[PDB]
Write a protein that binds this ligand. Sequence first.
Ligand SMILES: [Cl-]
Lengths: 361, 364
Amino acid sequence: NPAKPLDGFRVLDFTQNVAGPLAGQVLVDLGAEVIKVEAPGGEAARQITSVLPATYFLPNNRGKKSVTVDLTTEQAKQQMLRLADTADVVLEAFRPGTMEKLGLGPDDLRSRNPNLIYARLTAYGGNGPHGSRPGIDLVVAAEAGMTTGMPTPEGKPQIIPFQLVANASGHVLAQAVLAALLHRERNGVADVVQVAMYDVAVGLQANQLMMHLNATQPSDAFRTADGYIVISAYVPKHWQKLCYLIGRPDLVEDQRFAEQRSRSINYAELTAELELALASKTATEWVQLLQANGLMACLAHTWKQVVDTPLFAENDLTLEVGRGADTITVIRTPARYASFRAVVTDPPPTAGEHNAVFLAR
Amino acid sequence: NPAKPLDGFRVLDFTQNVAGPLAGQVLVDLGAEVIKVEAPGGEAARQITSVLPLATYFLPNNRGKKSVTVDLTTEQAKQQMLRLADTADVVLEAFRPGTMEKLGLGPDDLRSRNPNLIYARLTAYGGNGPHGSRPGIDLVVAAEAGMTTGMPTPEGKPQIIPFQLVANASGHVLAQAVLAALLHRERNGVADVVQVAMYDVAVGLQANQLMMHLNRATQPSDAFRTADGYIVISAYVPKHWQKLCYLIGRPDLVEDQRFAEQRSRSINYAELTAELELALASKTATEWVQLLQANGLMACLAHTWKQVVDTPLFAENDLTLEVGRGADTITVIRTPARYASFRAVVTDPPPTAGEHNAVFLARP
Ligand SMILES: [Cl-]
């Protein structure tokens, strides 16, 4: 078995739910030893099994070790202190100021261990009174303005039905941890790392938020004879090729849509004109025509459809964990490497599985 | 100036638009020297501007970088790139699959000459076969990955998320892989080839949702109607759920067979929403948010982007930085990760196209 980037490193994962464990999952896939620190009875996400025939817990805790502990007790605190002494990285995703209360804060652990990298993941940053609140993917996203510009028939704010902020924050946190490890390796500095879910959500909208601190058409989903097609062809070469393929050469030199900046302003009329031409063929027919001509177009798939597409199978996105009846298919982490496989087939640990190994007597 | 993790490393950035350059932007903030390789006249994204002159997709992702203008089709250009690659630690490319191989600048071409070079490829669909060979952009890749699922629109058209979620997420993932590769080289002496697909990232962002269809809740957690406006509440945990029922004056809901258990609340979400909104009718959304937040529950208003930039929390986090000299500056948002021992920020403006041609294209 080939060497991995993080072989020999030890991580203490004090995190729960999605964002924090996902970062740990990435570190596991890169070969680190990641030990979950859970409350008695295991992490609460373990019991949140909304599937019957473990959604949040299972895909993010493969190959991890586990210790179970009651951080109310002094005994526990001392065990964590001794365990932290042997750790390279500590991951915590509690409310700001929580870890300090437990006596396991940055100053507490780093005083004992000068090689320890301390990574903190919070909802809002904890840089002041406003950032002290606890948060979750839904609340953080809405507060960061991710519902903006999306109208609903009921007038209700659009809720994005997947954990976009939490999953993105996990990769950003893992990114920062890897950066800190490089910083320690090259410059001999064991740093304190901070990632805020709010900051990550703001970064995902940065181009749009930029306009208020100081689009590009055609790029939308268009109605056809049957179904919808998603087309992106705003550059002059593609925009022109598009007009020819749909049989509308007049649109190319049309004063409303002649210039790129002009198309964006007159998006409403542009949509009407395009959908008028697209009425000739079904969305499937249009997609095949445009793709053959090198234009960017596709169908808007559902989740059920996506897993069944040839492209999905082509990218080797899934792996199986467990022995037989309890074998579940999970999605791998996205980054791929040539010299090793960034995946682990070992299942998640039972709560406190490694208490004997890691907790001092 | 304190040391940064990538001081002394050199990166060749062949990428365009958002996803690729953002990864380079991350490397710049971490102290790496990143050189843009652009076509004559510069990157195409440099021209996508707004009215006051703000390149929305170029400016925030190319701060502190260096630029080299060149026509990769010519033999002279290829040779200059080969010499330039010899001095590089990392090569970033975001072209269509098979493009670099055609130009003679593929992984095998560069790594044969330079054995320490890390080759990073970012594609739309992975290029692992015929289906993944197509070019793509944030919008198209997201829609194909199923991101329009479950969101109703007035027109009945698929819901288009109005920001580049996939491109921005892919940028951080690509930077993540590059940093991992650099660690791999330092510790194991291996210079690897790393591949990141925007489609794979988009799939990963929906991992929890797609997972259900691969093996064929948590209420209350939604946006709720009040007397005035909507409130976003997340309180499915028994501790939060009980306190929520108390604060809204509905103790009956706690042991109500319909909503007693957490699984029951998930199944009967429709009736629960009706019950909750009946209680929330008493006060405006703003009044409810302050009450719940004071009691430690997770709740907020759904802000617009315009509202978001004016909030105290936004200013508290030092999210913005100004690029340029004096009054001639444009405000941009920084990369998210923060570090205590250094400042992951560069205030330098982007280079002009071909600004460093004299420095790097030689002919001294
Ligand atoms: Cl395969």
